[PDB]
Amino acid sequence: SGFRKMAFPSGKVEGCMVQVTCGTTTLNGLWLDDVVYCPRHVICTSEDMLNPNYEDLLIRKSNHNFLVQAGNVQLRVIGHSMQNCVLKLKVDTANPKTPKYKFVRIQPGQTFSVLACYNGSPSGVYQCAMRPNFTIKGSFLNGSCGSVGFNIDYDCVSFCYMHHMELPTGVHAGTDLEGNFYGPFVDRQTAQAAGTDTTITVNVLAWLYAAVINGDRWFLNRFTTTLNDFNLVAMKYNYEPLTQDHVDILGPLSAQTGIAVLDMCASLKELLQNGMNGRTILGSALLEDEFTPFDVVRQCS
Amino acid sequence: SGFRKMAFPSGKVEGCMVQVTCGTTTLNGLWLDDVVYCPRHVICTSEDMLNPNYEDLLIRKSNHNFLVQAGNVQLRVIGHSMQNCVLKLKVDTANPKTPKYKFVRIQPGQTFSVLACYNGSPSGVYQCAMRPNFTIKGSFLNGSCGSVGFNIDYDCVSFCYMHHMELPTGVHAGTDLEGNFYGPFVDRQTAQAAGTDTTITVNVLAWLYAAVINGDRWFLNRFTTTLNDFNLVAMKYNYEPLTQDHVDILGPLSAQTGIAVLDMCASLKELLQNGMNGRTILGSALLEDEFTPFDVVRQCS
Ligand SMILES: *C(=N)[C@H](CCS(C)(=O)=O)NC(=O)[C@H](CC1CC1)NC(=O)c1cc2c(OC)cccc2[nH]1
Ligand SMILES: *C(=N)[C@H](CCS(C)(=O)=O)NC(=O)[C@H](CC1CC1)NC(=O)c1cc2c(OC)cccc2[nH]1
């Protein structure tokens, strides 16, 4: 038993991290087979960054302007191209540590592991959720761009995030591995705001089940609610709507605990309307929304 | 920026995880050079577990009663011995993925990453701390014994924990890699109680320094204290007393902020005496105690 924020083991991804240098800019890249993926703003000077015309800037580069380092070994760049905000450097060497992998675009509310990397060297791993406003609350320092987020399923790594940006509020923005930003962000050097964020309701409910499985039950009550009446209250509090698909994916946790999904919704509605009254759930003073139902099932079954 | 519970990248440890089976019992082992380390209760039947005579049980075992597997690949066992609560199996293959490593015995308050493994297969990685009562608030399911906790310092893995048991309250107990339990626990199938837990004072102070570094400093006051007066008050609030080593490891944070250690102690003491008065620190109403001063230095520099 027990419940922790848990990331996927990172070794399959660690074997793919390299360092990419262009000019005086150094960031991380992802080496799969014979291609290195990295943020295209590596080609920018600080002047370019303000309003970069990326196609022009890239045409002016040669293969030799890119220095790729895997460990102590320089990889020779024999081609380059651009897919949206991601630069692809073809190298003359295939990565022997390439795992089975896919590039996927995740949905808001879904979680993934982030391998934070500096100068091509992995430094830490932690778990994140894509927020409804398409930011992530990460932990990143200068030189972290090109760090990736991923999930692992059997032996296949699904890469879903590459890091590009920190907003003035301190949350983070990035792209999928096809180079498309999550959210309304652009890779230029400007202060950018996100839309108003909301709370991931199906995740809060999954975490309330995790708390029950681990013996926290002070927040339960004898009541049930309708799904529509629950959603009226949830929206009032800036929570995302709960769909019937969400009710279904919570099925295994309802089964395990014997607590119907709409019974647990009546508890969540009482917590929104009354607060926690100085108490905690799983050691948290706040309702936690970055565990999906699958995360909880994986950990508690 | 951003401030998160972060685990170390787990690849170096993943390359060392194997499974060890004796009879029908399978747990995890750690394969370093040509030795596999694992919990000695793998040799027990359920009848043995209530009051095992490990010396006598081991004398009756031979090398050929132990099945060690890397994946489905058997490693032949060619010697065996017991060191306290850890079994050491010498195998005929030196692990080519052995990292530089050390075995260390950590102090209460120190944090580490846990790689949760089942049948020798890594499932997840998370960060936790050793509590003052020598338990960890981990996350483990059946078959997790032998999972290890570790820190990584440059390219060197310091192994500090091997998982052995879950107490009735749902917290976890285990050994260092020399087989010595943290705390007064024994590897038999009995209900064992941990001492009343306390708050890790050096870690709370590290987190207050993190708050100051980030501009959240309303709690700083114009007082100081002696170390002994602070320790005496700390104990009255179920906080651990500070050691000289705690004062030393807070030094870099003291220097960076300009706030003397004992001045920060006086600030914490006022917080404990008076409460938060409806204010928060780093967005939280609760004082965090599972970030060490090293963790803060890593994420705030
Ligand atoms: C990547 N290595 C780096 C992020 C580092 S972090 C702070 O997330 O650890 N990316 C950047 O520095 C981007 C580069 C731009 C092409 C996207 N820039 C920003 O993240 C950035 C710029 C600004 C500005 O510019 C005026 C104002 C406020 C915030 C901000 N963030
Ligand atoms: C190892 N794979 C397993 C821990 C799995 S967990 C629950 O942490 O995910 N270890 C055990 O089951 C140990 C084996 C003993 C040599 C140590 N036993 C316990 O953890 C254990 C036994 C008991 C009893 O026994 C009556 C009562 C209450 C709690 C308890 N815990």
Residue numbers in the entry:
A (entry chain B), B (entry chain A): 1 to 301
Relevant lines from the article:
All four compounds show a covalent linkage to the catalytic cysteine, Cys145, with contiguous electron density between the sulfur and carbon atoms and the C-S bond distance 1.76–1.77 Å. At the warhead position, when the group is a nitrile (compounds 5 and 7), the resulting imine nitrogen, formed following covalent attack by Cys145 thiol, forms a hydrogen bond with the backbone nitrogen of Cys145. At P1, the installation of a methyl sulfone moiety at this position results in hydrogen bonding to the imidazole of His163 as in the case of the γ-lactam, whereas the other sulfone oxygen is hydrogen-bonded to the side-chain hydroxyl group of Ser144. Substitution of γ-lactam for a sulfone at P1 led to a 10- to 20-fold decrease in potency for the aldehydes but up to a 750-fold decrease for the nitriles (compound 5 versus 7), suggesting a greater dependence on P1 for nitrile binding. Compounds 3–9 showed clear evidence of reversible binding, whereas the more potent aldehydes formed a kinetically stable complex with Mpro, with compounds 1 and 2 having estimated half-lives of >69,300 s and 30,500 s respectively. X-ray crystallographic studies demonstrated covalent binding, even for the nitriles with micromolar affinity, whereas no covalent binding was observed in the 13C NMR study for the most potent nitrile, compound 5. The lack of covalent binding offers a plausible explanation for the observed SAR where nitriles showed a greater dependance on the substitution of P1 versus the analogous aldehydes despite the similarity in the binding mode observed in the X-ray crystallography studies where all compounds were bound covalently.
SARS-CoV-2 Mpro is a cysteine protease that acts as a symmetrical dimer and displays positive cooperativity for substrate turnover. A series of potent reversible covalent peptidomimetic aldehydes and nitriles was designed as Mpro inhibitors. To examine the detailed binding mode of the compounds in the series, crystal structures were obtained of SARS-CoV-2 Mpro in complex with the 4-methoxyindole containing compounds 1, 3, 5, and 7. The overall binding pose was similar across the four compounds and in line with what has previously been characterized by Hoffman et al. The P1 group inserts into the S1 pocket of Mpro, and the cyclopropyl moiety inserts into the S2 pocket, whereas the indole maintains its position across these analogs.
